[PDB]
Subunit: 347 residues, 3 copies
């Protein structure tokens, strides 16, 4: 929120949070202080009766390391766009891939869940992504209320150097070729929603040569989700089947994967919101003798207390069900439990 400017048809909204956060875990790469902050600007300019221009930026600033540490801040979102009334909207930039239009329904845990679990950022069109052009349509041209669809194109983001390069090169794990995706969601009743999403991206030559795991020309996702949100109850599930698109930790990609997330929450009137969730990711046909493997498997229990719209506190308990094996060790996949405590100021 925090509208700091509204004058002559132009609006500026400064938003963010300061999340004082500690993790407790036997996993030493996760354990300890996790304090961070986010700061953002949402901007809007009226051009004419039918046309609005807009932009948005969101920055993540870690505060859990020293004043001499490196790489402590990064851009989550940065895009500019036009809204054409009910003919739709178009924006280009670093934005969410459309698959998250459905998987976001389960991204509601007090602390865990979302990107980093069954999917990641810079992971084709599953979460935040460089260089997405996104068309969105509301209520199917003002005709069918509650029916939303989106169409998305992403240009190649390639290697640092050599034949596969682009200006903005990165590691094979965060590369993509040309790709597209589409999402569709419908509020069948009030409170109840269904949704589908699909994506198709070319893979790069580095993705097919450098890591040992995952081979194929194309990465694909198919997602279906359901959501109940009403009477102080929140239930949601997401099922996603992927091809060459799910990270098998640090070792590469899974040729096939099946991802499942489900969550249930209740909002009490005095501000407490308990939460229980289950998440799994099942990888199939992995090279080097790995075969079928659990990529992710945990039960999540926790709660958030909302003091008001600007302040909350929370605990989250990740009960890790993975068995420690040679795949989990070599891929860097944590098999330990984790508790999180946080105190959050939001603006």
């Amino acid at each position: 929120g925090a509208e700091i400017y509204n004058k002559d048809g132009n609006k500026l909204d400064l938003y963010g949070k300061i999340d004082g956060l500690h993790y407790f875990s036997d996993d030493k790469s996760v354990d300890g202080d996790q304090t961070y902050m986010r700061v953002g600007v949402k901007g809007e300019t009226q051009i004419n009766d039918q046309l609005t221009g807009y932009g948005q930026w969101e920055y993540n600033v870690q505060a859990n390391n020293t004043e001499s540490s490196s790489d402590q801040a990064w851009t989550r979102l940065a895009f500019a766009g036009l809204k054409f009334g009910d003919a739709g909207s178009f924006d280009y930039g670093r934005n969410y891939g459309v698959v998250y239009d459905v998987t976001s329904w389960t991204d509601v845990l007090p602390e865990f869940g979302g990107d980093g679990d069954t999917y990641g950022s810079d992971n084709f069109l599953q979460s935040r992504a460089n260089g997405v052009a996104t068309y969105r349509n509301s209520d199917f041209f003002g005709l069918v209320d509650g029916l939303n669809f989106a169409l998305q194109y992403q240009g190649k983001n390639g290697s640092v150097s050599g034949e596969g390069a682009t200006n903005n090169g990165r590691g094979w794990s965060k590369q993509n070729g040309d790709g597209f995706g589409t999402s569709l969601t419908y509020d069948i009743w009030d409170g109840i929603s269904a949704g589908f999403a699909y994506s198709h991206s070319k893979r790069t030559d580095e993705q097919n040569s450098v890591p040992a795991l995952g081979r194929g020309d194309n990465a694909e996702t198919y997602t279906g989700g359901l959501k109940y949100d009403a009477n102080n109850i929140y239930l949601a599930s997401q099922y996603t089947q992927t091809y060459n698109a799910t990270r098998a930790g640090s070792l590469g990609f899974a040729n096939k994967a099946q991802n499942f997330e489900v969550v249930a929450q209740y909002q009490f009137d005095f501000g407490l919101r308990p939460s229980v969730a289950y998440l799994q990711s099942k990888g199939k046909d992995l090279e080097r003798g790995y075969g079928d493997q659990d990529i992710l498997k945990y039960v999540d229990v926790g709660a958030t207390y909302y003091f008001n719209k600007n302040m909350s506190t929370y605990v989250d308990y990740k009960i890790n069900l993975l068995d420690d094996n040679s795949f989990t060790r070599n891929a860097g996949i944590s098999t330990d439990d984790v508790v999180a405590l946080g105190l959050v100021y939001q603006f």
Copy 2:
């Protein structure tokens, strides 16, 4: 610029932009997503009838790489100052070298042009620079603007030539000064001259193969027509040991010319054509005379309003691919840019 605070003689202006930008080119180090944003603050405090204090900060944040990429944000401007009525001003910090008081006149292309082309940032007093003390004067104690500027040494990371804020030789400078002079001859027509002189550093005279000399110098003259929906401007600059011969060093002498023509239609379209070249002379290692930069630029911006615009820009590269361009890493390919921009 959005005024977010104005109370008790202190004002605070928040400004910036989000530039959704894609490049298309066979040069793979240029091609692809180039989305970035800029954010800044301009602050002004009334001290007395004859004295105002001010500061400004401008930050660049790239948004075209991943959340684990490094070195994606940097400060472009950061300076504090005093304004003594109309009798001029003084500021210290990271700011534009006074040469840009004239070369800024051709820095108006939809996307290309400006720093990175005939001159760069951290390039003596040609653009943005660390540690510049700048005295400016309107109406020469009429309509005649004068600046005098000093810059302290910015030297090597370590060794003899070090300062606290060390960097590579391409972005080093010794003690230097500059001066500029601009004048509105008619209404709409301006002329301008600028000169800079800086000591070079020991690393600049020892690590790169190209460019030797104790001093860097720039002589610039420029003209501008800006009236009747028409914008014409040119800039001619001669340099000694000051212009970068790509990654190979500096050019002992160079001649840079920039010219641009634009028209601004009432309904918001602004076509643009421009020509830029940089001619390097007397280069070591058998290079002799060499084109450093040569291209025609065509494109256009459509302004929806003062806060939103779209643009296309086409760089028609005229450099020939040769031993110098390859070794110095100078691109010879064309580029097309497409962008959509929100500004506040």
Copy 3:
């Protein structure tokens, strides 16, 4: 100052400065341009009659290096908290260790002094630190005016990897184990104050194994200080004894050290504020033959001219009293004088 948002019980203060600054010195690691800026946000939300929530972020951005330079920006403060009227306050995040509730009394020099001198940042609870939980009480529950106290806990911040690691690892010089601290200040009059602070932290394995200097399982600080601040006069002194806590430059820690700082200032009505100060740090029982060594010793003389509350200019002159010896050279400790000139815009 700069309240940019105050609406429905929520307020937001945008603060910072732009410091145009140049150092003159024969020390090449210090000499030259030092321009930098600070930006931050103080936020506060009223929750109920007895409870206020708040948070604060402060970022430091260097502007003295190039647009391709590395590691030019960092977080100084990031914390979130709750204030429960006169039962106290609690916050967690990156914040000041409580030792600084006393040593801050001498951190008033025009430019020098403060962190970097007798103590540094990420230096146990002596200054800004990762992951401190801080309980504060002012006026002793409302019963004794001018009596303030603090209790503080800090989780381990360990190595980058290995046995001693946490998620947010750093080098041995900025590491800490589990630790606590306490402070107590009393305003005897409304200008005269006395204060004490204590801290105790576990040392980490790398602090005992990598550097040459300093051995021990615990880091301890004892600090007493005095302050006179009224009638335009400012006198302040601080004495601190440390054990395994004071940095011996790059060589490690001093098994014990004695730090002394004293400063006197006067505020003229036209805005000039002269300052003289003296600072020293005496290290004892150093290994490798060093024995007793001066770690820091200098006299400071300077002045600040305030144009108003938003703009000032200053000179500061550090007259360095260290002998150039084997210790100072090997520990990277500067022995040269420094002059600073600055012009500062603040909001």
